[PDB]
C-alpha cells in the first residue's frame, strides 16, 4: 500500500493516508473556497481536495479511506476527488509513522 498508486479509474480502494498538514485559505472562482492540502510519506506525496465544510473543522492526524474514487488534476497538480458514488469513512487516529522528506511540492 503506497501513496504512489492513486491512479484514475481505480475501483475498490482501501488505501490509508494521514492528514498531518492543514489546508490554507485561498480563493477560487467567486464565492466558493475549494481548499487544498498536501501530505507526504516515505513513498510519496499527494494533494487532497478539501471542501469548506471539512476544512473549517479539520484537525491534523485523521485517517480516512475512500471507495470508488476518481483521480483529478488541478492546474498541473494531482488532486483526489469524491462524489457520484464515492464515500469517505474515518478509521482511527495517531497510529502512524511519517516521513516528510519525499515531498514533490518543492520548486
Amino acid at each position: 500500500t503506497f501513496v504512489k498508486d492513486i491512479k484514475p479509474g481505480l475501483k475498490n480502494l482501501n488505501l490509508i493516508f494521514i492528514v498531518l498538514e492543514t489546508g490554507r485559505v485561498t480563493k477560487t472562482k467567486d464565492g466558493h473556497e475549494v481548499r487544498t492540502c498536501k501530505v507526504a510519506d516515505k513513498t510519496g506525496s499527494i494533494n487532497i481536495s478539501v471542501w469548506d465544510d471539512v476544512g473549517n473543522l479539520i484537525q491534523p492526524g485523521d485517517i480516512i479511506r475512500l471507495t470508488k474514487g476518481y483521480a483529478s488534476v488541478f492546474k498541473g497538480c494531482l488532486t483526489l476527488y469524491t462524489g457520484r458514488g464515492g464515500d469517505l469513512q474515518k478509521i482511527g487516529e495517531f497510529c502512524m509513522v511519517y516521513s516528510e522528506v519525499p515531498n514533490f511540492s518543492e520548486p
Binding site: L20, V54, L57, P60, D62, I64, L88, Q89, K90, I91, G92, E93, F94, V97, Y98
Partner: protein
C-alpha cells in the same frame, strides 16, 4: 445520540455496543409496569453471562440517559446484579478514562450522581472508580466545568471521608491529588473558599493518617514547600520538629521519609491517559528526529497557559519517575530520551519555571540508592551533557551551575546526603560506562573556570 460527534467521526464500536444495550434494555421493558419488567429482565440476565453483561451495561447507560430513568434503572441494576457488578465497574472505568473527552454534560452529571450513589452504598471496588475518575482531572487548567467537577467529587469525598479511611491507599492518592490541586488553584474568592476547604481536609487527613501518608514519597515535601506560607503547614512542621513521635508513635522521624522512595502511582495519576499514551507511543515507535511535530502539537494545543510552566515540571517528574525503558530498547536506534529532556528544558521561558524544572530534575538526586533505583533517572542527564556540549552549551552550563550551587543551599544539616547521592550517581555512571571516559566532560575547556575548580575540589576521586 449520546456522545458529541459529527459525520466524519469514526463509528465507535464501543458506542455501537452501547446502542445495542439501549435497544435490548428499552425494547424489553416496553413501558410495562416495573414488576413484570424486572421479572423478564432477571430471566434474560440468568440466561447467560454475555447477556448479563449486556443488561448491566444497558442499565449503566440508562443511568447516564435521563434522571427518572436513571433512578429506576439504578434500582433495577442493584436488584438484578449477580456478581455485584465488579466487571461492570471495570467496564465503567474503561468507558470513563477512554470516552471522557466526548462525554455530554448531562451524562457527566448523571455519572457523578451514580458515583456518589455507589460510594454512599459502599459497593466493593468503588476505590478503583474513585481513583480513575480522579486521574482525569487535568493539572494547570482553569476551565469552569473541570473545576466544577473537581468541586463535586471533592464534596463526595468529604461527605464520605470514612469510606476513604477504610480505603488505605485512597487516603494517600486523595491527599496528594488535592495538594496538587491546591498548588494549581488560586485567583478568585470562590477559589479561595475552595482552597480553605481543601487545605482543611488535607490537614485533617495528614494528622489523622500520618502513618498512611508515609508511603507517598519525597514529593509530599515538594508539595509542602509550595504551600508552606499557610500557618497550618508551618504549625505541623514545627510539631514534627519538636516531637515527630507525638503525631504517630511508630513514626520515628523524617529519616524514614527521606530514605524512602516515591511510587510511580502518584507521579502517574495526575496525567490524563491520552498524554501518557502519546509519550509511550513516542518512546516506543517514534524514531529520533520526528519528536518536534508531536511535542509542538501538544504544546500549542494544551501547554499554552500560565500554569503550563509547572505542568512542564510535572511532565518532567512523570518521565523521570515512571518511564523506565528496557536496556534492550535502549540499545536500539529508538529516539533517545536526551532529546525529550532537551525539549522539556528549552521550553522554560521564565526563570521561575526553569528553577522549578531543575528542582524537579534534582529531586531524585538528593537521596540516590543504587540497589532499589534504576540508572534511568540519570542516563538522560549524562546523555544531555554529552550531546549538548557542542550545539547548546548554554543548557549544559545552566544545569551544571544549578546542580553545583544547590548542594550547600538546599539544607546544610543534610547537605552531606546530597553529596553522598551525587557521589553514588557518579559511581553508577562509572560502573555502567554509558560513555567511554568521563574525564573530558569534567574538565571541558569551554566550561567556566569556577565550575571545573569546584568539581575538582569536591571529588578528588574522579581525578
Amino acid at each position: 445520540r449520546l456522545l458529541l460527534s459529527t459525520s466524519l467521526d469514526a463509528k465507535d464500536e464501543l458506542e455501537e455496543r452501547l446502542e445495542r444495550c439501549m435497544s435490548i434494555v428499552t425494547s424489553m421493558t416496553a413501558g410495562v409496569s416495573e414488576r413484570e419488567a424486572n421479572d423478564a429482565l432477571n430471566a434474560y440476565v440468568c440466561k447467560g453471562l454475555p447477556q448479563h453483561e449486556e443488561i448491566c451495561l444497558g442499565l449503566f447507560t440508562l443511568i447516564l440517559t435521563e434522571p427518572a430513568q436513571a433512578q429506576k434503572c439504578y434500582r433495577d441494576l442493584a436488584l438484578v446484579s449477580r456478581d455485584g457488578m465488579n466487571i461492570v465497574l471495570n467496564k465503567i472505568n474503561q468507558i470513563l478514562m477512554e470516552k471522557y473527552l466526548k462525554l455530554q454534560d448531562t451524562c457527566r452529571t448523571q455519572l457523578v450522581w451514580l458515583v456518589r450513589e455507589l460510594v454512599k452504598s459502599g459497593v466493593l471496588g468503588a476505590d478503583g472508580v474513585c481513583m480513575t475518575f480522579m486521574k482525569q482531572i487535568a493539572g494547570g487548567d482553569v476551565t469552569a466545568k473541570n473545576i466544577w467537577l473537581a468541586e463535586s467529587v471533592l464534596d463526595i469525598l468529604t461527605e464520605q471521608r470514612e469510606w476513604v479511611l477504610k480505603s488505605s491507599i485512597l487516603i494517600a492518592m486523595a491527599v496528594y491529588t488535592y495538594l496538587r490541586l491546591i498548588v494549581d488553584h488560586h485567583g478568585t474568592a470562590q477559589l479561595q473558599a475552595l482552597r480553605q476547604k481543601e487545605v482543611d481536609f488535607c490537614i485533617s487527613l495528614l494528622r489523622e493518617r500520618f502513618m498512611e501518608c508515609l508511603m507517598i514519597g519525597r514529593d509530599l515535601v515538594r508539595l509542602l514547600q509550595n504551600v508552606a506560607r499557610i500557618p497550618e503547614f508551618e504549625l505541623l512542621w514545627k510539631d514534627i520538629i519538636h516531637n515527630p513521635q507525638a503525631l504517630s508513635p511508630q513514626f520515628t522521624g523524617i529519616l524514614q521519609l527521606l530514605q524512602s522512595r516515591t511510587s510511580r502511582k502518584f507521579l502517574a495519576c495526575r496525567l490524563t491517559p491520552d498524554m501518557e499514551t502519546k509519550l509511550l507511543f513516542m518512546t516506543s515507535r517514534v524514531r529520533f528526529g520526528q519528536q518536534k511535530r508531536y511535542q509542538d502539537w501538544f504544546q500549542r494545543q494544551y501547554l499554552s497557559t500560565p500554569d503550563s510552566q509547572s505542568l512542564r515540571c510535572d511532565l518532567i517528574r512523570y518521565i523521570c519517575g515512571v518511564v523506565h525503558p528496557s536496556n534492550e530498547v535502549l540499545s536500539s536506534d529508538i529516539l533517545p530520551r536526551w532529546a525529550i529532556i532537551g525539549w522539556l528544558l528549552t521550553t522554560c521561558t521564565s526563570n521561575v519555571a526553569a528553577s522549578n524544572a531543575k528542582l524537579a530534575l534534582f529531586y531524585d538526586w538528593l537521596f540516590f540508592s543504587p540497589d532499589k533505583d534504576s540508572i534511568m533517572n540519570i542516563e538522560p542527564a549524562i546523555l544531555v551533557m554529552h550531546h549538548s556540549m557542542k550545539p547548546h552549551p548554554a543548557i549544559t552550563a545552566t544545569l551544571l551551575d544549578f546542580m553545583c550551587r544547590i548542594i550547600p543551599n538546599f539544607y546544610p544539616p543534610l547537605e552531606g546526603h546530597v553529596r553522598q547521592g551525587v557521589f553514588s550517581s557518579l559511581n553508577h555512571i562509572v560502573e555502567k560506562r554509558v560513555l567511554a571516559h568521563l574525564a573530558p566532560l569534567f574538565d571541558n575547556p569551554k566550561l567556566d573556570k569556577e565550575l571545573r575548580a569546584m568539581l575538582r575540589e569536591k571529588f578528588p576521586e574522579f581525578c
